[PDB]
Design an enzyme around this catalytic site. Sequence first.
Site, PDB file in Angstrom:
ATOM      1  N   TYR A  25       0.823  -1.201   0.000  1.00 24.81           N
ATOM      2  CA  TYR A  25       0.000   0.000   0.000  1.00 24.81           C
ATOM      3  C   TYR A  25       0.861   1.256   0.000  1.00 24.81           C
ATOM      4  O   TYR A  25       0.444   2.302   0.501  1.00 24.81           O
ATOM      5  CB  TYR A  25      -0.965   0.018   1.193  1.00 24.81           C
ATOM      6  CG  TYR A  25      -0.288  -0.097   2.550  1.00 24.81           C
ATOM      7  CD1 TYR A  25       0.170   1.031   3.234  1.00 24.81           C
ATOM      8  CD2 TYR A  25      -0.115  -1.344   3.153  1.00 24.81           C
ATOM      9  CE1 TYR A  25       0.787   0.915   4.482  1.00 24.81           C
ATOM     10  CE2 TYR A  25       0.503  -1.469   4.392  1.00 24.81           C
ATOM     11  CZ  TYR A  25       0.946  -0.337   5.049  1.00 24.81           C
ATOM     12  OH  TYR A  25       1.557  -0.465   6.278  1.00 24.81           O
ATOM     13  N   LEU A  61      15.231  -4.982  10.935  1.00 23.58           N
ATOM     14  CA  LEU A  61      13.937  -4.611  11.501  1.00 23.58           C
ATOM     15  C   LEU A  61      13.122  -3.834  10.474  1.00 23.58           C
ATOM     16  O   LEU A  61      13.639  -2.902   9.850  1.00 23.58           O
ATOM     17  CB  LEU A  61      14.109  -3.762  12.764  1.00 23.58           C
ATOM     18  CG  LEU A  61      12.877  -3.054  13.339  1.00 23.58           C
ATOM     19  CD1 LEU A  61      11.914  -4.056  13.971  1.00 23.58           C
ATOM     20  CD2 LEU A  61      13.303  -2.031  14.373  1.00 23.58           C
ATOM     21  N   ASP A  62      11.849  -4.222  10.299  1.00 24.01           N
ATOM     22  CA  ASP A  62      10.889  -3.481   9.481  1.00 24.01           C
ATOM     23  C   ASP A  62       9.867  -2.854  10.416  1.00 24.01           C
ATOM     24  O   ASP A  62       9.019  -3.563  10.972  1.00 24.01           O
ATOM     25  CB  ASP A  62      10.187  -4.382   8.458  1.00 24.01           C
ATOM     26  CG  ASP A  62       9.331  -3.598   7.463  1.00 24.01           C
ATOM     27  OD1 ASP A  62       8.971  -2.437   7.758  1.00 24.01           O
ATOM     28  OD2 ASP A  62       9.021  -4.129   6.362  1.00 24.01           O
ATOM     29  N   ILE A  63       9.932  -1.530  10.561  1.00 28.01           N
ATOM     30  CA  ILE A  63       9.019  -0.771  11.415  1.00 28.01           C
ATOM     31  C   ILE A  63       7.772  -0.445  10.596  1.00 28.01           C
ATOM     32  O   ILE A  63       7.805   0.398   9.694  1.00 28.01           O
ATOM     33  CB  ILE A  63       9.687   0.505  11.949  1.00 28.01           C
ATOM     34  CG1 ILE A  63      10.946   0.161  12.737  1.00 28.01           C
ATOM     35  CG2 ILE A  63       8.747   1.286  12.851  1.00 28.01           C
ATOM     36  CD1 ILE A  63      11.610   1.385  13.420  1.00 28.01           C
ATOM     37  N   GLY A  66       3.339  -3.723   7.483  1.00 31.85           N
ATOM     38  CA  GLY A  66       2.240  -3.818   6.549  1.00 31.85           C
ATOM     39  C   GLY A  66       1.834  -5.264   6.346  1.00 31.85           C
ATOM     40  O   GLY A  66       1.929  -6.094   7.252  1.00 31.85           O
ATOM     41  N   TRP A  67       1.398  -5.576   5.126  1.00 28.24           N
ATOM     42  CA  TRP A  67       1.010  -6.937   4.785  1.00 28.24           C
ATOM     43  C   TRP A  67       2.194  -7.803   4.378  1.00 28.24           C
ATOM     44  O   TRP A  67       2.008  -8.851   3.737  1.00 28.24           O
ATOM     45  CB  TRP A  67      -0.072  -6.914   3.699  1.00 28.24           C
ATOM     46  CG  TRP A  67      -1.458  -6.594   4.259  1.00 28.24           C
ATOM     47  CD1 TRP A  67      -2.238  -7.401   5.044  1.00 28.24           C
ATOM     48  CD2 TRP A  67      -2.206  -5.387   4.063  1.00 28.24           C
ATOM     49  NE1 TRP A  67      -3.426  -6.762   5.356  1.00 28.24           N
ATOM     50  CE2 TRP A  67      -3.423  -5.523   4.766  1.00 28.24           C
ATOM     51  CE3 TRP A  67      -1.960  -4.199   3.368  1.00 28.24           C
ATOM     52  CZ2 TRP A  67      -4.392  -4.525   4.784  1.00 28.24           C
ATOM     53  CZ3 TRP A  67      -2.925  -3.206   3.389  1.00 28.24           C
ATOM     54  CH2 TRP A  67      -4.127  -3.376   4.093  1.00 28.24           C
ATOM     55  N   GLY A  68       3.408  -7.381   4.729  1.00 29.49           N
ATOM     56  CA  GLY A  68       4.550  -8.268   4.793  1.00 29.49           C
ATOM     57  C   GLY A  68       5.399  -8.374   3.541  1.00 29.49           C
ATOM     58  O   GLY A  68       6.391  -9.105   3.556  1.00 29.49           O
ATOM     59  N   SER A  88      -1.194  -3.111  13.615  1.00 32.14           N
ATOM     60  CA  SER A  88      -2.448  -3.587  13.047  1.00 32.14           C
ATOM     61  C   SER A  88      -2.581  -5.082  13.308  1.00 32.14           C
ATOM     62  O   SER A  88      -1.702  -5.862  12.924  1.00 32.14           O
ATOM     63  CB  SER A  88      -2.506  -3.306  11.546  1.00 32.14           C
ATOM     64  OG  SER A  88      -3.616  -3.979  10.967  1.00 32.14           O
ATOM     65  N   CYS A 258      -5.442  11.943  -4.803  1.00 29.85           N
ATOM     66  CA  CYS A 258      -4.030  11.821  -4.455  1.00 29.85           C
ATOM     67  C   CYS A 258      -3.176  11.702  -5.705  1.00 29.85           C
ATOM     68  O   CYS A 258      -2.102  12.313  -5.789  1.00 29.85           O
ATOM     69  CB  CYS A 258      -3.816  10.621  -3.524  1.00 29.85           C
ATOM     70  SG  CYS A 258      -4.285  10.985  -1.828  1.00 29.85           S
TER      71      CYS A 258
END
Length: 276
Positions: A25, A61-63, A66-68, A88, A258
Amino acid sequence: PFYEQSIYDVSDEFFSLFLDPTMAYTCAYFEREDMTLEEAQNAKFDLALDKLHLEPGMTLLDIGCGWGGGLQRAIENYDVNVIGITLSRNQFEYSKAKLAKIPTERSVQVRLQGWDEFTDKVDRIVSIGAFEAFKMERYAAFFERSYDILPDDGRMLLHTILTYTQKQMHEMGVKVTMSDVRFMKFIGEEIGQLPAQEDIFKFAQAADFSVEKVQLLQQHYARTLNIWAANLEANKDRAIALQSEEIYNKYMHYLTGCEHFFRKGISNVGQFTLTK
Ligand SMILES: CCNC(=N)NC(=O)Nc1c(CC)cccc1CC
Ligand SMILES: [Cl-]
Ligand SMILES: [Mg+2]
């Protein structure tokens, strides 16, 4: 004097009507112009991960994972341990299950956790599309926490939407119309604070990070949003079935508005390479 359905209330199934299969996203990167949306999303994660100079055996590390999809590319293309954190629950469960199916010889952890709780030592940090939700009153602590959990050669890649000042939009030739101001109000009542480029510099360099690179993907986001909107329109009847024509119209309005902002120059999006 009473209690009273927004774009936020949509299911993960709703997002799959218009995001690519990896459920990214965030801004894609059309490294080749004929890339599909999925190829360009992969290219955007690869672009970010390449800037971290990952070596075998490091921990990433992924801060705000999201959906990975970002950690999927990291596990597949690097021999690294990964930790992904998110607040989430849906994304936590989705990413944990998505990532469990990927063969690996390293450690893989997904947590329902915010950055202000995170204490593990990590070698590199990636953060794609999480910063937009931080309040500016939290910026300083974010960069301090990131700085402290990194080693002496630590690198971090921060990817975030950016805004311009009124003076900048003036000099750049960007004339903001009333429909643009109507749209910015719409974002208020349906979506609170976006940084300018100079803000990232200020707060990262205040936390003793060095900014080695900023890469701006303005027109890649315009194309990303264009494709998202075409997909959702293709899936309009299903979107209305899961939600409503109201919600379908709001999301289409939001995506295409957007898109217009990036295309005309009101908004940008940057990847910031930070070093310690
Ligand atoms: C803070 C977490 N969000 C992100 N970093 N990015 C998005 O929300 N991107 C986005 C935008 C922004 C231009 C408009 C419509 C739809 C989407 C995602 C489906
Ligand atoms: Cl993403
Ligand atoms: Mg992310």
